[PDB]
Amino acid sequence: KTTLFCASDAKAYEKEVHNVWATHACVPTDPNPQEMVLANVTENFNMWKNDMVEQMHEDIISLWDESLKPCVKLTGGSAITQACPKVSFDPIPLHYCAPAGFAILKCNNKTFNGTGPCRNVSTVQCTHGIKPVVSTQLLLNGSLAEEEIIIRSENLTNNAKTIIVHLNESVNIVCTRPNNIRQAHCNINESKWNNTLQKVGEELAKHFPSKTIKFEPSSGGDLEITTHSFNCRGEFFYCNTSDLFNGTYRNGTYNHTGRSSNGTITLQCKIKQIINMWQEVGRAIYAPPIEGEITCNSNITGLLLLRDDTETFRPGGGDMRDNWRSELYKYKVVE
Numbered sequence: 001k002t003t004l005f006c007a008s009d010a011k012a013y014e015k016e017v018h019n020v021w022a023t024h025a026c027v028p029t030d031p032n033p034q035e036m037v038l039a040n041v042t043e044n045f046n047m048w049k050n051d052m053v054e055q056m057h058e059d060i061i062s063l064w065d066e067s068l069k070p071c072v073k074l075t076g077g078s079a080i081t082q083a084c085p086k087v088s089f090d091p092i093p094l095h096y097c098a099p100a101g102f103a104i105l106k107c108n109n110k111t112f113n114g115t116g117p118c119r120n121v122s123t124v125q126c127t128h129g130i131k132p133v134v135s136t137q138l139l140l141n142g143s144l145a146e147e148e149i150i151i152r153s154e155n156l157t158n159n160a161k162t163i164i165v166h167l168n169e170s171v172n173i174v175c176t177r178p179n180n181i182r183q184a185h186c187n188i189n190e191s192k193w194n195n196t197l198q199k200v201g202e203e204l205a206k207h208f209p210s211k212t213i214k215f216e217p218s219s220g221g222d223l224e225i226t227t228h229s230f231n232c233r234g235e236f237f238y239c240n241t242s243d244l245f246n247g248t249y250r251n252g253t254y255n256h257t258g259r260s261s262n263g264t265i266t267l268q269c270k271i272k273q274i275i276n277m278w279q280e281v282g283r284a285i286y287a288p289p290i291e292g293e294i295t296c297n298s299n300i301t302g303l304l305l306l307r308d309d310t311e312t313f314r315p316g317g318g319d320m321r322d323n324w325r326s327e328l329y330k331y332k333v334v335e
């Protein structure tokens with residue numbers, strides 16, 4: 001429909017790079033914005049074909065190119081070389097705002113699966129604050145569904161279509177390279193993982209009725225999608241998830257099958273310098289890791305799954321727009 005603009009809450013004295021970018025590219029946020037219900041209106045949205053996602057994707061690409069410059073960038077046969085300073089890197093929330101003459105409709109149905117008609121609807125200047133968090137397999141630091149877990153998919157029959165599971169309760173994941181310099185690990189409380197895959201299996205079961213629901217670690221691909229990869233404090237972690245996506249939900253009960261220990265699942269992570277870019281088809285080389293404890297304490301707030309009697313779900317990811325979709329699903333720009 002139109003060109004959106006961003007409102008952030010960053011300040012010009014942070015050397016953190018999301019702050020720097022936002023202070024150049026975004027306008028300050030309205031202290032008290034004002035909504036505008038319309039609980040009879042009913043309009044349709046389709047999260048899977050939402051231009052707001054394109055615009056945000058463009059902006060995050062811009063952000064990363066100005067903030068996480070790689071020492072080397074291989075695209076086609078070209079290699080570009082730049083200074084790759086280590087930087088202060090912690091994502092801040094970004095608001096997307098409709099400019100003069102445009103408004104953002106926001107669907108208020110707390111169970112809205114993200115496509116089709118929605119009943120309660122509001123008008124807003126801006127989205128909520130969205131932390132543009134690049135990762136695969138697990139979505140981190142998002143907003144939780146407020147009712148029940150919600151399964152989103154462009155077409156649940158088409159197994160080639162990424163499924164976004166929207167959790168209603170955070171699950172902590174703590175990743176640390178402590179004080180091999182490239183080796184780290186993550187801790188998830190196996191009990192709350194336990195429960196979470198319980199409930200996720202229930203919801204997947206309503207969509208998949210005759211069948212037993214198996215979680216299995218991702219088959220093949222680049223490391224960035226066969227492991228839970230993400231950026232912590234500038235460094236690209238790649239964490240093994242085969243003790244995480246490893247479980248069976250059969251008789252209305254979930255049985256976890258990956259190996260736990262003293263009540264917590266522990267993922268082996270590598271920090272890596274040679275990255276398969278999400279922005280485009282290419283490779284990006286970075287400097288070896290900073291020193292000391294690198295630690296990220298994050299909320300797993302959704303999953304990205306792919307489906308292959310039994311239905312099997314393995315972790316997925318790689319198309320960063322799905323991350324943005326998970327947060328922008330309940331908004332469209334109109335007028």
Ligand SMILES: CCOC(=O)N1c2cc(CNC)ccc2[C@H](NC(=O)C(=O)Nc2ccc(Cl)c(F)c2)[C@H]1CNC(=N)N
Nearest residue numbers: 134135136224229230231276277278279280281282318319
């Ligand atoms: C233009 C958008 O590209 C795409 O849709 N991709 C896509 C799509 C699919 C499946 N289809 C739905 C599978 C794999 C990919 C690739 N994803 C990454 O590479 C990717 O996520 N890396 C990474 C890097 C750093 C971090 Cl921290 C991170 F968390 C992730 C990408 C192509 N890029 C490439 N082959 N270099």
Ligand SMILES: *[C@@H]1O[C@H](CO)[C@@H](O)[C@H](O)[C@H]1NC(C)=O
Nearest residue numbers: 147148149168169199202203
């Ligand atoms: C979250 O969703 C699950 C299943 O959809 C439900 O059992 C649970 O009560 C919901 N709310 C929570 C867990 O707070």
Ligand SMILES: *[C@@H]1O[C@H](CO)[C@@H](O)[C@H](O)[C@H]1NC(C)=O
Nearest residue numbers: 113115116117151152153156
């Ligand atoms: C979402 O709901 C619409 C109708 O509201 C339905 O057509 C579609 O199958 C649902 N999709 C999922 C993934 O639940």
Ligand SMILES: *[C@@H]1O[C@H](CO)[C@@H](O)[C@H](O)[C@H]1NC(C)=O
Nearest residue numbers: 154155156157158159160161
């Ligand atoms: C989803 O894709 C399937 C094929 O995988 C096909 O029957 C149809 O086009 C889609 N179904 C719906 C309900 O849109």
Ligand SMILES: *[C@@H]1O[C@H](CO)[C@@H](O)[C@H](O)[C@H]1NC(C)=O
Nearest residue numbers: 223226227240241242243268
């Ligand atoms: C993850 O760990 C398992 C068991 O150690 C191993 O078999 C698997 O290949 C690993 N995957 C990756 C992508 O490192």
Ligand SMILES: *[C@@H]1O[C@H](CO)[C@@H](O)[C@H](O)[C@H]1NC(C)=O
Nearest residue numbers: 216217242243246257258259
């Ligand atoms: C589940 O975990 C065990 C060890 O923790 C591993 O041997 C097994 O291969 C995993 N399941 C799958 C389907 O990979």
Ligand SMILES: *[C@@H]1O[C@H](CO)[C@@H](O)[C@H](O)[C@H]1NC(C)=O
Nearest residue numbers: 140141230231296297298299
């Ligand atoms: C998630 O948010 C917490 C608190 O803001 C932060 O410490 C953590 O590093 C974030 N995780 C990622 C992957 O950015």
